[PDB]
Amino acid sequence: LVYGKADIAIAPLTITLVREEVIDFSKPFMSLGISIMIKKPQKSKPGVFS
């Protein structure tokens, strides 16, 4: 975009300061963040003395 090879980058591009200094972003169309991913809590094997 800075070199003119594209007009608009409609992609999941994160609005950040470094990028913001050279291009301009629209208002966010999608807000996200860091998150935790775990395996679904499968049923436990019955313990001795259950």
């Binding site: 975009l1 594209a6 007009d7 608009i8 980058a9 409609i10 992609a11 999941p12």
Partner: peptide, 24 residues
């Protein structure tokens, strides 16, 4: 016309099954 740039990133931008048949 304009030059819209993106990346291959499911489900943001995904190729259809018939991408070899259709090119646009």
């Amino acid at each position: 016309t304009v030059v819209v740039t993106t990346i291959l990133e499911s489900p943001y931008v995904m190729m259809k099954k018939n991408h070899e048949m259709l090119e646009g």
